[PDB]
Amino acid sequence: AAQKSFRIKQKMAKAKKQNRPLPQWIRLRTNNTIRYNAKRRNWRRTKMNI
Amino acid sequence: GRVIRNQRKGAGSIFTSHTRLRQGAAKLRTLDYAERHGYIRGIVKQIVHDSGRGAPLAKVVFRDPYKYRLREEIFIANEGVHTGQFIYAGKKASLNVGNV
Amino acid sequence: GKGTPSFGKRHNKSHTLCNRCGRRSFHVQKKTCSSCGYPAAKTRSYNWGAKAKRRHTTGTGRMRYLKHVSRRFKNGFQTGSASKASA
Amino acid sequence: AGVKAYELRTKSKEQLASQLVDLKKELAELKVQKLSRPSLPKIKTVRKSIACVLTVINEQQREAVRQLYKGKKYQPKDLRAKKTRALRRALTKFEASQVTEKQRKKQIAFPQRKYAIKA
Amino acid sequence: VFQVSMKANKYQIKKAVKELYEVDVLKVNTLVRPNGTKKAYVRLTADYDALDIANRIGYI
RNA sequence: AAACUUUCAACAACGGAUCUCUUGGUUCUCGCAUCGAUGAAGAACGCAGCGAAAUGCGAUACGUAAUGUGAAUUGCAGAAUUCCGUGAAUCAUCGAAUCUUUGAACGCACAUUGCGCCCCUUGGUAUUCCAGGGGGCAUGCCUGUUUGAGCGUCAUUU
RNA sequence: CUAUCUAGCGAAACCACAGCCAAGGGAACGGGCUUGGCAGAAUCAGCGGGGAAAGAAGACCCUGUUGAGCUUGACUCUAGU
RNA sequence: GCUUGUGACGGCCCGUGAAAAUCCACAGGAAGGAAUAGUUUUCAUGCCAGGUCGUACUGAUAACCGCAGCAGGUCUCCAAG
RNA sequence: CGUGGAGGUCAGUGACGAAGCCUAGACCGUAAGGUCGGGUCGAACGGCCUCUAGUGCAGAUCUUGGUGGUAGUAGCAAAUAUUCAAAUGAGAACUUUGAAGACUGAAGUGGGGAAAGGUUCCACGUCAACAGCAGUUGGACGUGGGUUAGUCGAUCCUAAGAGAUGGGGAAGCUCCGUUUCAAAGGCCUGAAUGCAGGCCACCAUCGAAAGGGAAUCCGGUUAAGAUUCCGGAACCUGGAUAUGGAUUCUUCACGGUAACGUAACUGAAUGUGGAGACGUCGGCGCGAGCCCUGGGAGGAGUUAUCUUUUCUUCUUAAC
RNA sequence: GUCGAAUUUGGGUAUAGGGGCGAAAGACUAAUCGAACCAUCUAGUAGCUGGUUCCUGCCGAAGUUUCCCUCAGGAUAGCAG
RNA sequence: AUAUUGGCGAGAGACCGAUAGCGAACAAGUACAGUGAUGGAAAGAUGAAAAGAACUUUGAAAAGAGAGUGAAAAAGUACGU
RNA sequence: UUGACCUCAAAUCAGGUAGGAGUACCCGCUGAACUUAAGCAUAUCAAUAAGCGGAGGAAAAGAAACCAACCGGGAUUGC
Ligand SMILES: NC[C@@H]1O[C@H](O[C@H]2[C@@H](O)[C@H](O[C@@H]3[C@@H](O)[C@H](N)C[C@H](N)[C@H]3O[C@H]3O[C@H](CO)[C@@H](O)[C@H](O)[C@H]3N)O[C@@H]2CO)[C@H](N)[C@@H](O)[C@@H]1O
Ligand SMILES: NC[C@@H]1O[C@H](O[C@H]2[C@@H](O)[C@H](O[C@@H]3[C@@H](O)[C@H](N)C[C@H](N)[C@H]3O[C@H]3O[C@H](CO)[C@@H](O)[C@H](O)[C@H]3N)O[C@@H]2CO)[C@H](N)[C@@H](O)[C@@H]1O
Ligand SMILES: NC[C@@H]1O[C@H](O[C@H]2[C@@H](O)[C@H](O[C@@H]3[C@@H](O)[C@H](N)C[C@H](N)[C@H]3O[C@H]3O[C@H](CO)[C@@H](O)[C@H](O)[C@H]3N)O[C@@H]2CO)[C@H](N)[C@@H](O)[C@@H]1O
Ligand SMILES: NC[C@@H]1O[C@H](O[C@H]2[C@@H](O)[C@H](O[C@@H]3[C@@H](O)[C@H](N)C[C@H](N)[C@H]3O[C@H]3O[C@H](CO)[C@@H](O)[C@H](O)[C@H]3N)O[C@@H]2CO)[C@H](N)[C@@H](O)[C@@H]1O
Ligand SMILES: NC[C@@H]1O[C@H](O[C@H]2[C@@H](O)[C@H](O[C@@H]3[C@@H](O)[C@H](N)C[C@H](N)[C@H]3O[C@H]3O[C@H](CO)[C@@H](O)[C@H](O)[C@H]3N)O[C@@H]2CO)[C@H](N)[C@@H](O)[C@@H]1O
Ligand SMILES: NC[C@@H]1O[C@H](O[C@H]2[C@@H](O)[C@H](O[C@@H]3[C@@H](O)[C@H](N)C[C@H](N)[C@H]3O[C@H]3O[C@H](CO)[C@@H](O)[C@H](O)[C@H]3N)O[C@@H]2CO)[C@H](N)[C@@H](O)[C@@H]1O
Ligand SMILES: [Mg+2]
Ligand SMILES: [Mg+2]
Ligand SMILES: [Mg+2]
Ligand SMILES: [Mg+2]
Ligand SMILES: [Mg+2]
Ligand SMILES: [Mg+2]
Ligand SMILES: [Mg+2]
Ligand SMILES: [Mg+2]
Ligand SMILES: [Mg+2]
Ligand SMILES: [Mg+2]
Ligand SMILES: [Mg+2]
Ligand SMILES: [Mg+2]
Ligand SMILES: [Mg+2]
Ligand SMILES: [Mg+2]
Ligand SMILES: [Mg+2]
Ligand SMILES: [Mg+2]
Ligand SMILES: [Mg+2]
Ligand SMILES: [Mg+2]
Ligand SMILES: [Mg+2]
Ligand SMILES: [Mg+2]
Ligand SMILES: [Mg+2]
Ligand SMILES: [Mg+2]
Ligand SMILES: [Mg+2]
Ligand SMILES: [Mg+2]
Ligand SMILES: [Mg+2]
Ligand SMILES: [Mg+2]
Ligand SMILES: [Mg+2]
Ligand SMILES: [Mg+2]
Ligand SMILES: [Mg+2]
Ligand SMILES: [Mg+2]
Ligand SMILES: [Mg+2]
Ligand SMILES: [Mg+2]
Ligand SMILES: [Mg+2]
Ligand SMILES: [Mg+2]
Ligand SMILES: [Mg+2]
Ligand SMILES: [Mg+2]
Ligand SMILES: [Mg+2]
Ligand SMILES: [Mg+2]
Ligand SMILES: [Mg+2]
Ligand SMILES: [Mg+2]
Ligand SMILES: [Mg+2]
Ligand SMILES: [Mg+2]
Ligand SMILES: [Mg+2]
Ligand SMILES: [Mg+2]
Ligand SMILES: [Mg+2]
Ligand SMILES: [Mg+2]
Ligand SMILES: [Mg+2]
Ligand SMILES: [Mg+2]
Ligand SMILES: [Mg+2]
Ligand SMILES: [Mg+2]
Ligand SMILES: [Mg+2]
Ligand SMILES: [Mg+2]
Ligand SMILES: [Mg+2]
Ligand SMILES: [Mg+2]
Ligand SMILES: [Mg+2]
Ligand SMILES: [Mg+2]
Ligand SMILES: [Mg+2]
Ligand SMILES: [Mg+2]
Ligand SMILES: [Mg+2]
Ligand SMILES: [Mg+2]
Ligand SMILES: [Mg+2]
Ligand SMILES: [Mg+2]
Ligand SMILES: [Mg+2]
Ligand SMILES: [Mg+2]
Ligand SMILES: [Mg+2]
Ligand SMILES: [Mg+2]
Ligand SMILES: [Mg+2]
Ligand SMILES: [Mg+2]
Ligand SMILES: [Mg+2]
Ligand SMILES: [Mg+2]
Ligand SMILES: [Mg+2]
Ligand SMILES: [Mg+2]
Ligand SMILES: [Mg+2]
Ligand SMILES: [Mg+2]
Ligand SMILES: [Mg+2]
Ligand SMILES: [Mg+2]
Ligand SMILES: [Mg+2]
Ligand SMILES: [Mg+2]
Ligand SMILES: [Mg+2]
Ligand SMILES: [Mg+2]
Ligand SMILES: [Mg+2]
Ligand SMILES: [Mg+2]
Ligand SMILES: [Mg+2]
Ligand SMILES: [Mg+2]
Ligand SMILES: [Mg+2]
Ligand SMILES: [Mg+2]
Ligand SMILES: [Mg+2]
Ligand SMILES: [Mg+2]
Ligand SMILES: [Mg+2]
Ligand SMILES: [Mg+2]
Ligand SMILES: [Mg+2]
Ligand SMILES: [Mg+2]
Ligand SMILES: [Mg+2]
Ligand SMILES: [Mg+2]
Ligand SMILES: [Mg+2]
Ligand SMILES: [Mg+2]
Ligand SMILES: [Mg+2]
Ligand SMILES: [Mg+2]
Ligand SMILES: [Mg+2]
Ligand SMILES: [Mg+2]
Ligand SMILES: [Mg+2]
Ligand SMILES: [Mg+2]
Ligand SMILES: [Mg+2]
Ligand SMILES: [Mg+2]
Ligand SMILES: [Mg+2]
Ligand SMILES: [Mg+2]
Ligand SMILES: [Mg+2]
Ligand SMILES: [Mg+2]
Ligand SMILES: [Mg+2]
Ligand SMILES: [Mg+2]
Ligand SMILES: [Mg+2]
Ligand SMILES: [Mg+2]
Ligand SMILES: [Mg+2]
Ligand SMILES: [Mg+2]
Ligand SMILES: [Mg+2]
Ligand SMILES: [Mg+2]
Ligand SMILES: [Mg+2]
Ligand SMILES: [Mg+2]
Ligand SMILES: [Mg+2]
Ligand SMILES: [Mg+2]
Ligand SMILES: [Mg+2]
Ligand SMILES: [Mg+2]
Ligand SMILES: [Mg+2]
Ligand SMILES: [Mg+2]
Ligand SMILES: [Mg+2]
Ligand SMILES: [Mg+2]
Ligand SMILES: [Mg+2]
Ligand SMILES: [Mg+2]
Ligand SMILES: [Mg+2]
Ligand SMILES: [Mg+2]
Ligand SMILES: [Mg+2]
Ligand SMILES: [Mg+2]
Ligand SMILES: [Mg+2]
Ligand SMILES: [Mg+2]
Ligand SMILES: [Mg+2]
Ligand SMILES: [Mg+2]
Ligand SMILES: [Mg+2]
Ligand SMILES: [Mg+2]
Ligand SMILES: [Mg+2]
Ligand SMILES: [Mg+2]
Ligand SMILES: [Mg+2]
Ligand SMILES: [Mg+2]
Ligand SMILES: [Mg+2]
Ligand SMILES: [Mg+2]
Ligand SMILES: [Mg+2]
Ligand SMILES: [Mg+2]
Ligand SMILES: [Mg+2]
Ligand SMILES: [Mg+2]
Ligand SMILES: [Mg+2]
Ligand SMILES: [Mg+2]
Ligand SMILES: [Mg+2]
Ligand SMILES: [Mg+2]
Ligand SMILES: [Mg+2]
Ligand SMILES: [Mg+2]
Ligand SMILES: [Mg+2]
Ligand SMILES: [Mg+2]
Ligand SMILES: [Mg+2]
Ligand SMILES: [Mg+2]
Ligand SMILES: [Mg+2]
Ligand SMILES: [Mg+2]
Ligand SMILES: [Mg+2]
Ligand SMILES: [Mg+2]
Ligand SMILES: [Mg+2]
Ligand SMILES: [Mg+2]
Ligand SMILES: [Mg+2]
Ligand SMILES: [Mg+2]
Ligand SMILES: [Mg+2]
Ligand SMILES: [Mg+2]
Ligand SMILES: [Mg+2]
Ligand SMILES: [Mg+2]
Ligand SMILES: [Mg+2]
Ligand SMILES: [Mg+2]
Ligand SMILES: [Mg+2]
Ligand SMILES: [Mg+2]
Ligand SMILES: [Mg+2]
Ligand SMILES: [Mg+2]
Ligand SMILES: [Mg+2]
Ligand SMILES: [Zn+2]
């Protein structure tokens, strides 16, 4: 939030890196369930809570 | 029932005294060898107003008997005490306004 | 305007992240974590809270040490190396 | 590929020190080519090798420090029994063994008698 | 421009930048990228060419 | 008479009942006795040639060593496939290590990647100042040690 | 500016079954029962007579050996004193 | 003329209107102090270095709160004819 | 009569088709129900004798899940307003550009920040979903790029306030307390480091991105960062410190009546003084920027007619 | 309505559920206040509403007696299988 | 000798059969809600095997129509019945 | 003057130990009300729930200041 505490920039940095679509190749794997990333996030929809 | 207003005051909280801008506490000089036997001299350096107190305070310097330093005291000005006057303090001290 | 208008005023956070438990339960003004209890010595738990318990108990975590203790007990807490087959 | 555990154990410390440094040189240079190419699976074996080199160098110095303390009463807590908190404060086989002089004679005067009953 | 240990201050950078690539480092400015990795802007003094030493490390 | 509506059939929709599946749950029994200041439980952030999870791990980071095993791993790639071999492997086993930032959590803090002090060592003229590296400084208590305090107190003074 | 008509988008209330009357008797004010009036597809804009319309297990009232806020020389206690 | 800063002042109170870090100064006279020399680093000039975290963008009839791209709510600076 | 399971038995049925399901098809039973054909189906299932229950639904404003009529209906009408053409595209009332018409009218629909969000910023790709019409556009989707400081903040200080410590309560989780009924230390010097000097000593710490406070400016630069980068010019703290200059034979400066002046001009313990450092209102003087404005030197608009015209450039940083 | 003060307001900070806080409305204490929100005791008790799942065959009632802090409930006798 | 809804390792049942059985047979104490304590889901089944529909054709495209695979497409990742 | 003693301190003195987690069972402390009584106060719920301190693999109890009153019996625990 503007001038931000490091811990929160760090916590931010995390959730940024883990918002991605599934890698396409995860769905070729033998015995594979996952079709899509079900934990995907968005700034408009769900808020992080710091 | 509820807890009536006059009970809530002993818990402090809202009802504590508003002390910020006050001068120090108004206290005499400590009772020591000086005042108990002879007297002592000090200048009332300024009188001045103490917040929430309607009785002006007089700030009296003294010289430390047992060390070389200045020691300031906070006295309640006695009506006719005045900046620059010499306050005398002790059993041997004279009988005059401002003296203890 | 006890409703929608008064909601627009909420920018301050009663709690930030609790160093110990990682929730946002750490009361900024109270300087005590709501969920975990930091910085009390003990960790917060209640018997009427049995669901809260099974959220935080052992094995909900990584067990980084404890998990291996059983194998190490299974055989004698072995000192030393392994002798191979040799010839 | 890369390094091997037994081969390293023969080489001297000061060689291992240099072993590392040119592995770091390589692994570093790997990460350069790595981003100019459609991946680079090769870099795995060198960063694993660095672990092995560093495991051995550790094995030596720990064993060496193990020697310097051999036989002494007080050894670094690093190198001690481990086992269990509760365990390692249990009485020693010696301490549990002790018996009052009154009893050691009673444990001699009339110690348990093996017997049987026929017919 | 180098990715750097998040644990490495501007001294450690300059010392290790000199030691590894054998160059004089004028000044060092470090930020932390959005992803949580430190980026260092390491300026080489006039005595060297940064593009040379760049593809002396083999990127160009 | 159409349209429309209603009822029935057929096919098509809608929806997921029913049937059959079951690496799950549930309950009974049997055996065993091992968490932590040697840093646990739990947390945070990281770690893969290409991963967001789950799982595993800790800058030696889906693992390093040891032991067994005897050729795979497999989504594509890659390899050295280093196969009569100290040797494949997301294998089994585990006795050796590593183990970031934490946490009873230990120099002090902690909505801060904030701030002191000691020791060793390296570089910048360098006992002092700056910097890199390495190891350090919590509490109560016990036993011991060394150093102290008290006209509480016995001797010696000379 | 709506409403209205159109393209596109597209909810909710409510719903035993339903929906024309007069009288009769009837739980003493019927859409249905009985006797009469009658009775012709499919519909649009309006309307506020009815649907004892919708909204919410009536708050009034009584009942309950059901409460709670409150008061007091009710019953029984109690911190302080 | 507008905004704004400063100089000199007048009035108001049974209201008389923060603290600490920090910095310079004075009184004092402990002390060191020269001749073929010893003095001063509050005068000039010259040498080297300064770590760590934050730094994007919205700040609102769309980027915060109010289930939402909600006619609501949310502190402040600049201000032309 | 019927359902899940259990012992026994038909050496029961079945991939040549079990179970289920669908049948305005058949038969049996008063009935619960039973049986058969046909279709669809894919791996199990039934008769009799017994055992056993989480054993039969239409309702409970029942539970969960799914679906209707209402109904292409209520609606999609606040915030003055749109129009022509091109480009792009399979596709344009909605995208881009041009033109025209307008609005907010600086107490703004302008230019920045605080809390808060957390990549929304920027660029390329791109339209299934979302943007209650649309979408070639997007704060969406996909892939990447991006936030550089000794001087701006934090960090330091203390505020209300919070909080360890000797301690005293409380069965205890814990309570009180912040200088208190405590043996509460950490500086500068010499002799490379201990003893001898010696002063001084009521007192952890947390608590302000609007309070206090060491110190930077202009110009240029990106798709996206800048008081941070680049170019130039500075300053502050911290070290080192040499030369110049100053002072002394009257050792620790000279001058002025004095207010005070000078490039410097020794100063321990200790004491003290000052700046930090502060309310509110009212006018009055002065400055800066803005406003208005003349000459002149450029550029621009209008010019049937009129206007020595209307608009616009003429700037100056901290140090 | 008020608009230079009992003015409006940011942030920091303090008071917590029989408690707080209240220029007093039982007001406010996170859309919650004549006792907050969360979990547990708890499947709280209910003489009171509501519901209570297959078929056939035979028999077949009571609203009365007495007692009851009994009158919407029981005990009791009667009717019934 | 006795206790044992925990820990570790086992063997079982006239138990439950995806609205059942633990809340969770699944990236389940997860997604999500709340300032907070806490609250807390949904969701198993193509086929023996992807053989996951080459190719032609209409279409801006999503797709349709041929045509192929297969025991079956009356199994086409909207997948057993 | 010098040497012990008692008491009481300090040290980053030399060696250690306590904390926290778990909590089905176990030893204690503390401690309800819903509820039943067809009302309700004792009583009941219950020496229970919640709260607190301490363990082990079991804990605890135990070799009798016991039980009995018998011709006596003989640590404790459990059925
Ligand atoms: N309660 C605050 C009290 O302030 C007192 O302090 C008094 C003074 O020491 C202090 O004076 C400050 C001075 O410290 C500071 N360094 C300079 C400042 N100008 C002075 O301020 C004071 O004097 C000036 C001039 O007379 C006035 O304009 C101003 O209103 C006044 N507060 O201000 C106070 C008088 O107003 C004492 N420290 C003590 O009694 C107490 O802390
Ligand atoms: N966001 C922090 C807090 O999370 C709380 O809830 C969190 C928990 O339920 C859960 O967090 C668990 C945590 O319980 C458990 N003890 C450890 C575990 N690793 C955490 O996991 C979480 O963290 C990861 C990593 O950032 C995230 O991907 C994700 O939020 C979640 N899986 O994830 C939730 C994330 O919101 C509350 N919602 C709230 O107090 C606050 O938002
Ligand atoms: N001082 C207590 C002793 O600390 C010892 O531990 C020593 C180290 O192992 C320990 O190091 C910690 C480490 O645990 C941790 N995981 C990483 C951390 N940076 C280190 O921290 C150490 O240095 C940092 C420097 O910033 C200090 O801030 C910190 O106070 C200090 N403990 O810190 C101690 C030295 O300061 C032992 N654990 C033990 O004997 C005892 O607890
Ligand atoms: N005070 C001396 C004079 O101050 C004048 O300026 C002063 C005034 O403008 C103004 O002073 C006002 C005064 O006007 C008015 N009549 C009285 C008021 N108390 C003063 O205020 C002053 O004193 C109060 C303490 O009383 C402080 O708290 C306050 O900060 C200070 N400004 O504040 C300035 C500083 O005191 C001029 N500088 C000059 O005429 C002269 O120096
Ligand atoms: N806004 C900035 C101002 O611009 C002004 O700029 C004016 C001058 O530069 C210049 O003045 C010229 C004059 O030199 C020349 N001899 C003739 C010319 N017509 C004048 O211009 C004139 O413009 C119009 C007349 O059309 C008048 O309204 C205006 O007052 C007058 N200056 O034309 C400008 C018109 O305003 C002034 N320089 C000065 O006030 C200031 O810089
Ligand atoms: N059209 C040529 C290619 O078809 C490919 O797709 C092939 C199939 O995957 C696709 O199958 C579709 C299916 O997607 C969709 N859900 C509908 C239907 N089940 C299938 O339909 C297909 O099979 C049926 C049966 O024989 C044919 O009659 C029909 O023509 C054909 N399109 O039909 C295509 C064959 O005609 C790819 N889409 C692409 O490579 C390209 O479009
Ligand atoms: Mg899944
Ligand atoms: Mg969340
Ligand atoms: Mg009360
Ligand atoms: Mg006070
Ligand atoms: Mg809300
Ligand atoms: Mg805030
Ligand atoms: Mg608060
Ligand atoms: Mg408190
Ligand atoms: Mg702590
Ligand atoms: Mg459990
Ligand atoms: Mg488990
Ligand atoms: Mg498990
Ligand atoms: Mg490990
Ligand atoms: Mg920085
Ligand atoms: Mg990046
Ligand atoms: Mg009809
Ligand atoms: Mg099957
Ligand atoms: Mg691999
Ligand atoms: Mg890549
Ligand atoms: Mg993980
Ligand atoms: Mg994996
Ligand atoms: Mg392969
Ligand atoms: Mg292959
Ligand atoms: Mg393995
Ligand atoms: Mg291992
Ligand atoms: Mg560790
Ligand atoms: Mg740590
Ligand atoms: Mg710490
Ligand atoms: Mg160090
Ligand atoms: Mg200790
Ligand atoms: Mg209408
Ligand atoms: Mg229409
Ligand atoms: Mg609507
Ligand atoms: Mg609704
Ligand atoms: Mg309605
Ligand atoms: Mg009706
Ligand atoms: Mg009539
Ligand atoms: Mg009638
Ligand atoms: Mg009538
Ligand atoms: Mg009628
Ligand atoms: Mg009716
Ligand atoms: Mg009819
Ligand atoms: Mg009839
Ligand atoms: Mg009729
Ligand atoms: Mg009639
Ligand atoms: Mg009507
Ligand atoms: Mg109606
Ligand atoms: Mg209503
Ligand atoms: Mg209503
Ligand atoms: Mg009612
Ligand atoms: Mg009601
Ligand atoms: Mg009412
Ligand atoms: Mg009544
Ligand atoms: Mg009654
Ligand atoms: Mg009552
Ligand atoms: Mg004017
Ligand atoms: Mg005041
Ligand atoms: Mg001064
Ligand atoms: Mg002087
Ligand atoms: Mg910036
Ligand atoms: Mg910015
Ligand atoms: Mg703005
Ligand atoms: Mg809005
Ligand atoms: Mg929002
Ligand atoms: Mg408005
Ligand atoms: Mg608004
Ligand atoms: Mg406002
Ligand atoms: Mg049966
Ligand atoms: Mg059953
Ligand atoms: Mg059977
Ligand atoms: Mg059978
Ligand atoms: Mg057969
Ligand atoms: Mg069947
Ligand atoms: Mg039929
Ligand atoms: Mg058939
Ligand atoms: Mg069919
Ligand atoms: Mg069949
Ligand atoms: Mg099958
Ligand atoms: Mg089969
Ligand atoms: Mg049957
Ligand atoms: Mg049932
Ligand atoms: Mg049913
Ligand atoms: Mg039904
Ligand atoms: Mg029904
Ligand atoms: Mg509907
Ligand atoms: Mg209809
Ligand atoms: Mg439509
Ligand atoms: Mg319409
Ligand atoms: Mg309307
Ligand atoms: Mg409008
Ligand atoms: Mg057009
Ligand atoms: Mg065109
Ligand atoms: Mg438009
Ligand atoms: Mg346009
Ligand atoms: Mg206008
Ligand atoms: Mg303004
Ligand atoms: Mg406004
Ligand atoms: Mg901006
Ligand atoms: Mg954008
Ligand atoms: Mg959208
Ligand atoms: Mg739309
Ligand atoms: Mg569309
Ligand atoms: Mg994007
Ligand atoms: Mg600054
Ligand atoms: Mg501070
Ligand atoms: Mg204080
Ligand atoms: Mg305290
Ligand atoms: Mg005291
Ligand atoms: Mg010493
Ligand atoms: Mg500040
Ligand atoms: Mg910008
Ligand atoms: Mg520059
Ligand atoms: Mg003024
Ligand atoms: Mg300046
Ligand atoms: Mg009025
Ligand atoms: Mg007025
Ligand atoms: Mg206020
Ligand atoms: Mg309570
Ligand atoms: Mg009460
Ligand atoms: Mg109280
Ligand atoms: Mg008020
Ligand atoms: Mg009232
Ligand atoms: Mg609410
Ligand atoms: Mg409320
Ligand atoms: Mg109300
Ligand atoms: Mg009430
Ligand atoms: Mg509440
Ligand atoms: Mg709530
Ligand atoms: Mg019940
Ligand atoms: Mg109960
Ligand atoms: Mg009952
Ligand atoms: Mg009744
Ligand atoms: Mg009676
Ligand atoms: Mg009734
Ligand atoms: Mg009877
Ligand atoms: Mg009979
Ligand atoms: Mg059990
Ligand atoms: Mg349990
Ligand atoms: Mg095994
Ligand atoms: Mg068995
Ligand atoms: Mg299912
Ligand atoms: Mg389920
Ligand atoms: Mg289902
Ligand atoms: Mg079911
Ligand atoms: Mg069942
Ligand atoms: Mg469930
Ligand atoms: Mg999910
Ligand atoms: Mg909740
Ligand atoms: Mg299925
Ligand atoms: Mg399968
Ligand atoms: Mg084509
Ligand atoms: Mg195209
Ligand atoms: Mg075909
Ligand atoms: Mg063929
Ligand atoms: Mg095919
Ligand atoms: Mg074929
Ligand atoms: Mg066949
Ligand atoms: Mg088939
Ligand atoms: Mg099929
Ligand atoms: Mg397919
Ligand atoms: Mg599909
Ligand atoms: Mg379907
Ligand atoms: Mg199907
Ligand atoms: Mg199947
Ligand atoms: Mg020690
Ligand atoms: Mg404990
Ligand atoms: Mg316990
Ligand atoms: Mg009762
Ligand atoms: Mg009762
Ligand atoms: Mg009662
Ligand atoms: Mg009792
Ligand atoms: Mg209990
Ligand atoms: Mg144990
Ligand atoms: Mg046992
Ligand atoms: Mg025992
Ligand atoms: Mg005895
Ligand atoms: Mg016995
Ligand atoms: Zn916590």
Contacts of D35 in chain E (CB under 8 A): 59
Residue B49 structure tokens: 């107003």
- Chain A residues in contact with chain E using a Cβ-Cβ cutoff of 8 Å: 9-10, 12-14, 16-17
Q: How far apart are CA B51 and CA B22, in angstroms?
A: 5
Closest residue (Cα, C1') to F43: C21
Contacts of D81 in chain C (CB under 8 A): 79
Q: Specify the experimental method.
A: X-ray
Question: In degrees rounded to 5, what are phi and psi of residue C4?
Answer: -40, -50
Cβ(B29)–Cβ(B62) below 8 Å: yes
Max CA pair span of chain A: 47
CB crowding D7-34: b at 16 or more within 10 Å, else e: ebeeeeeeebeebeeebeeeeeeeeeee
D83 in contact with C, Cβ within 8 Å: yes
Residue B53 structure tokens: 């107190």
Q: Which residues contact E11 (CB under 8 A, 6 or more apart)?
A: none
Q: Which residues contact D43 (CB under 8 A, 6 or more apart)?
A: D27, D30, D31, D34
Q: How far apart are CA D57 and CA D20, in angstroms?
A: 10
SS3 B55: coil
Q: Separation of CA D87 and C1' L57 in angstroms?
A: 14
**Between chains, do C13 and A11 touch, taking CB under 8 Å as contact?**
no
What are the residues facing B57 on neighbouring strands? B48, B76
Cβ(D29)–Cβ(D22) below 8 Å: no
Q: Which of E24, A48, D24, E12 is nearest to C17 (CA)?
A: A48
Q: Is the peptide bond preceding residue A23 cis, with omega within 30 degrees of 0?
A: no
Q: How far apart are CA B81 and CA B76, in angstroms?
A: 10
**Between chains, do A16 and E32 touch, taking CB under 8 Å as contact?**
no
Q: How far is the CA of A39 from the centre of ligand 71 (A)?
A: 40
Cβ(B90)–Cβ(B39) below 8 Å: yes
- DSSP annotation of D79 reads G
E31 in contact with A, Cβ within 8 Å: no
Q: Is the CB of A15 under 7 A from strand I?
A: yes
Distance of residue D58 Cα from the nearest chain E Cα, in angstroms? 24
Resolution (A): 3.3
State the SS3 of chain C: CCCHHHHCCCCCCCEECCCCCCCCCEECCCCEECCCCCCCCCCCCCHHHHHHHHHHCCCCCCCCCHHHHHHHHHCCCCCCCCCCCCC
Residue E59 structure tokens: 């990127």
**Between chains, do A16 and E35 touch, taking CB under 8 Å as contact?**
yes
Q: How far apart are CA A7 and CA C51, in angstroms?
A: 29
What is the H or E stretch that residue B59 is in? strand B57-63
Give helix then strand counts, H and E, for chain D: 6, 0
CB crowding B26-39: b at 16 or more within 10 Å, else e: beebeeeebbeeeb
Alpha helices in A1-50 (DSSP H): 6-17
Q: How far is the CA of A3 from the centre of ligand 116 (A)?
A: 15
C36 is in an annotated binding site: yes
Instruction: Pick the residue of D63, D80, D84, D88 with the most C CBs within 10 A to test the interface with C by mutation.
Output: D84
Q: Separation of CA B5 and C1' G75 in angstroms?
A: 31
Q: Which residues contact C9 (CB under 8 A, 6 or more apart)?
A: none
Contacts of C13 in chain A (CB under 8 A): 50
